[PDB]
Design a protein around this ligand. Structure first.
Ligand SMILES: CNc1nc(C)c(-c2nc(Nc3cccc(S(N)(=O)=O)c3)ncc2C#N)s1
Lengths: 299, 257
């Protein structure tokens, strides 16, 4: 009877352990999204993905991170209550087929995504599943990070964590090659793949298997060697039989972009994770010298 | 490196908010410091049998101290509180945690599966889902970066002294995790190399040998009397070649402060 003040409106989508509806608070008027977890079918108690998602999101309050409003623990169920946003970035790109997305809107969305990710990293959190489906937009020009069910708290210096994380098309080369240690640089590689996709409106590296994904990255950026990336020929899944492709001209990778734009994308896609740019340093890049906040055309 | 200073500042803020109440045991009707020492020694044993990380053990001990700061508990239920806290810490921190049936089995069937899962829910309610707490272990791995040069023996001995402090609520509940890590690091370095608390960590932390002195005099006595303590599981563990046999080194007779 603890959900007495909410009225259901319509279903939004499906998920891992939970399913998601749009609802309305009958006393205040507030619109929300509700995620439900059944515990009846749970022979192991509260799931480890829900325990990480709630403990970490309570600590993260920022304008470009989606807000957790309440947790309700009645009966054989656990309900999570979130602020409501109107649409996802993957749906919005599909609807922009004919016009395309104007450059000042692209520049404002990237600047805002970099502010939210720097806040995560300064508070010792890795996200590990950045993709257009998990990024949400409203009618006043804002964009926000969502879905923290695959996230984790890290230490200084890191130790070995779960392998083969991140959806395949958005996954960094140090995870594909089996390296013992990974950190904050894996989330920057995913956002660079997303910047290219907003400009061309198709995925940059769409592979069907782990070896197919690696050979697509090599044909665009060149096969890496010891000069470009010290230590690379010693990694667990590196092989001496890999073909050897030449690196290509960046003006040909995303042809509509200007000189400042090409400079920033090449620093987000550096092979060596020690030399790859941080979210904090990227905020001062000259690409952002004339940034504003446009509203989008929705419906 | 890029975020090292931001992260050290944020953890110094959260250790004050996650701290237990210094005088709680005097207000518990039925349990004692000695019965708590017995529970913590048994948890060290469980972590060795299932091969769990040191960090998982430090987190479960923080959850127990916070719960008993606000809830009265009889001596026959203390073991059920500890089994539930070690289950939650494993789900938070480990790549492959043990199943619920394995936690039911190590209690020699003192408790049922249904009782263990209802206690998990009550601990989550009392701590309001606030589980990402700072530990002695998280401060030590940052301080290790200031060695010149690095020394495997100094690292393993500092972890061993920090672990012994988990066992005895009198006196270690009165000090913060960042302060106990400072005393363990200086004691290990001096024992092995003859060197002292370096100037580069005074600039990072703001702590000196004078501010560290009270915690240091307590930890020196603990180290000298360890072979006679009623609880012995931590000394057995640190005999292993994984930790370089550090528990067999002799303590210094005097410190000269
Ligand atoms: C993708 N994982 C998500 N978990 C929550 C709770 C999400 C959420 N969704 C909305 N509204 C919404 C609107 C349009 C489309 C969609 S989608 N991508 O088809 O499910 C969702 N609002 C808030 C949240 C949150 N948190 S998404």
């Amino acid at each position: 009877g603890s959900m007495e003040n909410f009225q259901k409106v319509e279903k939004i989508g499906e998920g891992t352990y939970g399913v998601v509806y749009k609802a309305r608070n009958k006393l205040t008027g507030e619109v929300v999204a509700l995620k439900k977890i059944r515990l009846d079918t749970e022979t192991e108690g509260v799931p480890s993905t829900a325990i990480r998602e709630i403990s970490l999101l309570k600590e993260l309050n920022h304008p470009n991170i989606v807000k957790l409003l309440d947790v309700i623990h009645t009966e054989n169920k656990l309900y999570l209550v979130f602020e409501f946003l109107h649409q996802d970035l993957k749906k919005f790109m599909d609807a922009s087929a004919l016009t395309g997305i104007p450059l000042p809107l692209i520049k404002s969305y990237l600047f805002q995504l970099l502010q939210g990710l720097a806040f995560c990293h300064s508070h010792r959190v890795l996200h590990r599943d950045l993709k257009p489906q998990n990024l949400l937009i409203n009618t006043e020009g804002a964009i926000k990070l969502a879905d923290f069910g695959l996230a984790r708290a890290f230490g200084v210096p890191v130790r070995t964590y779960t392998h083969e994380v991140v959806t395949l098309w958005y996954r960094a080369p140090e995870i594909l090659l089996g390296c013992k240690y990974y950190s904050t640089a894996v989330d920057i590689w995913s956002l660079g793949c997303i910047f290219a996709e907003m400009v061309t409106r198709r995925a940059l590296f769409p592979g069907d298997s782990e070896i197919d994904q690696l050979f697509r990255i090599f044909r665009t950026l060149g096969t890496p060697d010891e000069v470009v990336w010290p230590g690379v020929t010693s990694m667990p899944d590196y092989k001496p039989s890999f073909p050897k492709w030449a690196r290509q001209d960046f003006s040909k990778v995303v042809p509509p972009l200007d000189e400042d734009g090409r400079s920033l994308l090449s620093q987000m896609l550096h092979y060596d994770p020690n030399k790859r740019i941080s979210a904090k340093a990227a905020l001062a890049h000259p690409f952002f010298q004339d940034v504003t906040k446009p509203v989008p055309h929705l419906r | 490196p890029d975020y090292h200073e931001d992260i050290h500042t944020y953890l110094r803020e959260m250790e004050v908010k996650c701290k237990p109440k210094v005088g709680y045991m005097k207000k518990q009707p039925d349990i004692t410091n000695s019965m708590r020492a017995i529970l913590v020694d048994w948890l060290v044993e469980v972590g060795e049998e299932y091969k769990l990380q040191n960090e998982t053990l430090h987190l479960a001990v923080n959850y127990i101290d916070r719960f008993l700061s606000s809830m009265s508990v009889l001596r026959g239920k203390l073991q059920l509180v500890g089994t539930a806290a070690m289950l939650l810490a494993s789900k938070f921190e480990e790549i492959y945690p043990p199943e619920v049936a394995e936690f039911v089995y190590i209690t020699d069937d003192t408790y049922t599966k249904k009782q263990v899962l209802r206690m998990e829910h009550l601990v989550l309610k009392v701590l309001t889902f606030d589980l990402a707490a700072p530990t002695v272990n998280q401060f030590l791995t940052q301080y290790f970066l200031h060695q010149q040069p690095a020394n495997c023996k100094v690292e393993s001995l500092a972890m061993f002294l920090g672990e012994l402090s988990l066992i005895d609520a009198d006196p270690y509940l009165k000090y913060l995790p960042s302060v106990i890590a400072g005393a363990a690091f200086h004691l290990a370095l001096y024992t092995v190399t003859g060197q002292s608390w370096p100037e580069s960590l005074i600039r990072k932390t703001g702590y000196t040998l004078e501010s560290l002195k009270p915690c240091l005099m307590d930890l020196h006595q603990t180290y000298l009397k360890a072979p006679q303590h009623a609880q012995q599981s931590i000394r057995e563990k640190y005999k292993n070649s994984k930790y370089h046999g550090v528990s067999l080194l002799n303590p210094p007779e005097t410190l000269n402060l």
